[PDB]
Amino acid sequence: IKTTPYLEGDVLSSDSGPLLSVFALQEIMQKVRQVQADDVQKILDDIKALAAEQVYKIVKVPSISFRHIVMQSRDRVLRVDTYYEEMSQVGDVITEDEPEKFYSTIIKKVRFIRGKGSFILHDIPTRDHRGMEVAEPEVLGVEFKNVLPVLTAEHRAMIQNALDGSIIENGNVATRDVDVFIGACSEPVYRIYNRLQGYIEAVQLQELRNSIGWLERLGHRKRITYSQEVLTDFRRQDTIWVLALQLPVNPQVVWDVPRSSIANLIMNIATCLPTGEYIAPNPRISSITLTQRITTTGPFAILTGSTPTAQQLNDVRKIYLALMFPGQIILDLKIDPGERMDPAVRMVAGVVGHLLFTAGGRFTNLTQNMARQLDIALNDYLLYMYNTRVQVNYGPTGEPLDFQIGRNQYDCNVFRADFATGTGYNGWATIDVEYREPAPYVHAQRYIRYCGIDSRGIGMTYHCYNEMLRMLVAAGKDSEAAYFRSMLPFHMVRFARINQIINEDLHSVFSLPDDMFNALLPDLIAGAHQNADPVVLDVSWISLWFAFNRSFEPTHRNEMLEVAPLIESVYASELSVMKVDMRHLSLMQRRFPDVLIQARPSHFWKAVLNDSPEAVKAVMNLSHSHNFINIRDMMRWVMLPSLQPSLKLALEEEAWAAANDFEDLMLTDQVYMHRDMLPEPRLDDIERFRQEGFYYTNMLEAPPEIDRVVQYTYEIARLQANMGQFRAALRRIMDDDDWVRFGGVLRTVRVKFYDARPPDDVLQGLPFSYDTNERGGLAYATIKYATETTIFYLIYNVEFSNTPDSLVLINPTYTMTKVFINKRIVERVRVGQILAVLNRRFVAYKGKMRIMDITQSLKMGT
Amino acid sequence: DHRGMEVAEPEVLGVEFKNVLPVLTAEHRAMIQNALDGSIIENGNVATRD
Structure with a gap:
């Protein structure tokens, strides 16, 4: 399947150009830049990199936490631990004038201590000594080599046998036999290591089964393109699971963030929107000689035979994207004082926009301005008489369509715009939204159907097209009457495909909730948008005609559809982390008033956002640049109760516990x-x-x-x-x-x-x-x-x-x-008790164990 | 920002007093500073605008 040809300057071409998702991202960013004005591949793979996030570090050897200095003597040497040095060197300069810098530095401190402390042992080396299993010197938490060449032989022997005595103790923890020994480690990272080990020894295989079952639930709803299960090979006793993430996410948490409509829309585009191609109803007909195509005179005949170029193609795909997203994308016309064109293109666009767009009912994807001006275009067209002269009977007002036409008096005043029911557009007296079964996502129950049809149709019509036929046969324009009568099935199948794409692929956490979807239209009518914000795009005139003459059919699916639950679960976990960080910052400020520096919720939010994954930072920044927030929103969003439990949040909480x-x-x-x-x-x-x-x-x-x-x-x-x-x-x-x-x-x-x-x-x-x-x-x-x-x-x-x-x-x-x-910090200690730091229990798993999480390991996708 | 509150810079206020700074003593400049920095900025709404 190749796209229908479109002219580029002077030579015809048939290339598809850039991807539709890339086009959407660049158009949205350009629009928000224009709003504030008084990257696509890097933002896309920054979104994609949220999948490969790693919280725990499997390691051969635990980190060295001490070192020694020798000063011309045998009895005493200096000792120092490297934790304090590494804690100090990762700071930033502080002055009172920037609480933003101050609290961002504090957040950097706590993030560093958590990241340093999170690790786990898997394959530590062992050696032998007279039948006793002993740990090698390099696996210990204390490194010393400079001390050896200079000390007296009796001290060397007395420390060598003590070092050799560090034998392995074999014990039976819940995963049967592991290895247990003693070592030395700094206190806070040891505390967080203990917390991580306590989480590891906790068992939630039933939670794993529930996550699996929800995965097959979403998979059977997404049976069109989701098919992957490697459950058969999982069940071996010599394996360990880490439940660092809970997969059945709650969309209420992610939709609680104020003014997140733009960010949710852009992420939905990033992770779900498919790529397609554009074709005419009858292929190759642009290659025939034009004399067959231009049959006669008239406005429709003038528009027929024209070819589009890059601007019209981009506006056509803009129209299609706005049609795929009714609840967020709205349109307006691109009017500028330099215009000059034949009125027939505006006339036919006014005719077609009634069929192509829907208004009123339960959702509308147009503005009042377009509704009114499409209506006046229709008034101009229906009054425009060139080949015949018929009687007319006008009405009391000068409003559009306030007259009666035809040998029988037929009222065209119905398609005057009225958002209460949407008489003039596809929402007139026809159902568009319904409910079938409890969805896997508990906030997106609705099914969106255009023209009341279902993909699960030959010859069927609908009310609006029937009444368009009624007006056209009353006007006696039998040429374009037969034209549209022949053109119906193309429109029907194109709208069926759009329906299928809307209801099938886009079911994700980023979909707008049902209550706010219902409340969108009253908010637009009132003009005050307390809840949510749509976005409006500019589109030209002949783009309507070319959109009606083209269709959209998918060819290549979204590459990121396989890991979207994973990335959105990580997203929710990160949001919960940021919220709890703001909470503990406020708590610490209240705890220590006399020496700390007071600030605002805005500064706290900026501090917790300053260090954050780049995709999250970018989407929040663009959403907040599009739509502003006040202190009330921050104080509200802190007080909301819901959290997304995760190992990441547990480690953050214990890091704060150590950082009190x-x-x-x-x-x-x-x-x-x-x-x-x-x-x-x-x-x-x-x-x-x-x-x-x-x-x-x-x-x-x-x-x-x-x-x-x-x-x-x-x-x-x-x-x-x-x-x-x-x-x-x-x-x-x-x-x-x-x-x-x-x-x-x-x-x-x-x-x-x-x-x-x-x-x-x-x-x-x-x-x-x-x-x-x-x-x-x-x-x-x-x-x-x-x-x-x-x-x-x-x-x-x-x-x-x-x-x-x-x-x-x-x-x-x-x-x-x-x-x-x-x-x-740095202490001069007698040589005998240099091993007095050997005071912490270390445990390690056998080498033959396979430690893995299936959810992250599933990324291969074959 | 002073002590967590938003305050306007001293040139916004339509008072010109730069010439008399060297003749005040320590206490006088301290009290004039305390008086001037207390003019905080308050949030308000006009025609549904912030």
Whole structure:
């Protein structure tokens, strides 16, 4: 099947061009850009990438959580855990002026801790020792190699046998035999690991069966193109399922998001709309000589014989798309002051639009403006008499069709537009919506049938076409009367195909709910759209005639139809995650008023949307750019009760549970400034310096004293900066040898170790920035209160004593601000209890086990 | 944004006072600042518009 030929400039062509879904996406984005104005493949595969989302990480070896530093001695060495470093390095700079940035950084913190903590062991290695199964050194949570070459032999033996004693313990958990041993791991990721393991040991095979059964339910409704089951090979005992997602989604949650009509429509286009081809009722007739086609004179004869081009083809497919989506896509005419054309095209378009479009009844896909102007076009056509002269009898008003025509007086005033019943269009006295059986989706019960027919028809007519025949035979235009009489079956089969596409392929979670579908028309009549918003597109004049002369038939199905339940379930899970994140942000703000910074629901929504999958971000952004929201919508949408339970939400909740201690997230307010001379090695006695060495840090091991210390909150800092005595006050208070505190807000802290002398900025930076704006201003010099601040440990390299050029600071200097934390970060520990961290239970599954989820593994689709 | 409320910039208000800033003391500028920053912006509806 090939498309009917259409002219391109001067040579005929028959190429289908770009895909219909791509055309829809680009037209919708162009329209919303025009609305706000005062990508298609990347958005499509960003939607597609929602399927391959992975929450859990199967891994050979658990992550290393410790490392060691040696300082010229055997009794004690430094230990540090890498979790705090990785927690600190993923932050962002904080100032009070942007709560958006502040809370987006907080959300990044909690997302990082969840993503780091979620993992699982499957195939860990084992070794042998005298018949006892022992874990190899590299599978443990502590890595040490630098300690080995330098320690004394007795210590080496005493740690080697203790390391060798880490034997495997064989136990019987509910999946029969697994492997159990001891290890070391940082606390929060261990807590979330325990939560994940507790979810794993939970059993919901009945839930799996229910999800399967709903899958065959939707499959037998979608029997036309859905056919896949691999259930036979599933039942082997040597297997493990992860139920990270619940498949029977609830559409109420996804339809609860305010002003999501545009996003739902665009996603439905992305995931369900099929690709087809356009053909004339009688193929190849554009190739015959034109003299046979142009039979005589007249408006219909003038339009017949014309050929369309790219603009008319695009408008025709626009008309078809608007006809496939009645409840959201509406049309208007493209009028501009440069118009000039023969009136016959407008006349015939006015005639055809009555048959092609439906109005009134239960749904309407036209505007009042089109209804009225199509009506005046029909009035002009029916008055237009060229080949005959017949009697007319007019009415009291100047409204269109207010007259009587024919030898018998026939009233044409019925097809004057009236949205209450839709007399002039296909909704006149004919049913369009009905109900048959409980659908798999509990919000899309309706069946949409055009002209009252069912695909499950030769020679049948309907009321509107009958009355069009009545008017045309009253007008005595027997030429186009016989033309339309012959043209009926083409229209009937095309509308049957459109009905089949609407009711079969489009049954998805993104369909508009039935109550809002019924309420669409009263809202349009009233003009105030409290509930939902349709979108209107521009279409030309002869596009109507060419649409009537063409048809649409499908050729290639939607490639994403196989994984659409999966992607929409992931979508609902993500929405629930965002909602619960907003909830806990509000709760944390209420919990900690004195030091945190208050904000708005709009800022909270922006913070939870800032880090989010790109397709979700794009569709929400375009929907909100099309239609705006207020604080009332956010406060309402938070208070709605429904949630979509998932492993993702459980991990988020437990991450928040670990993150209730907010200072554990490398955030603090305990920064201070006190002048201190920078310690340097004497570097005179080579042997003694080689034996001892030196290290340093700006750590505060203890909190500073309650007295001999001053405070600066942000308001007082601002007032003092506007005074201009800020530097003087600071210099005086440092001459006083008093401590100073910058408390009041949260500052992000970075951490760094250095084996050489660091640059001067990290050596002696300040917690703030000071800029003197131009003289004659209102506020004078200004303070940025919080900036980059780095806690640092200096550990020299004693080998560089041969070349002191890279270690000597030339001139002695003063050191700057110190930072306090309560958590133990870097600790000098005696060599004997370096294994004292070995305090966490680890369990692993056998290699022969097959760990898999059928729902995600089903993506092959063969 | 100040303390979580929307406030207009000081040039929107039709008062010109830039010349007298250096002659006020600490308390006077503190109280004039407290008075000026308290002019919050309120939501309203006119002809079903925000």
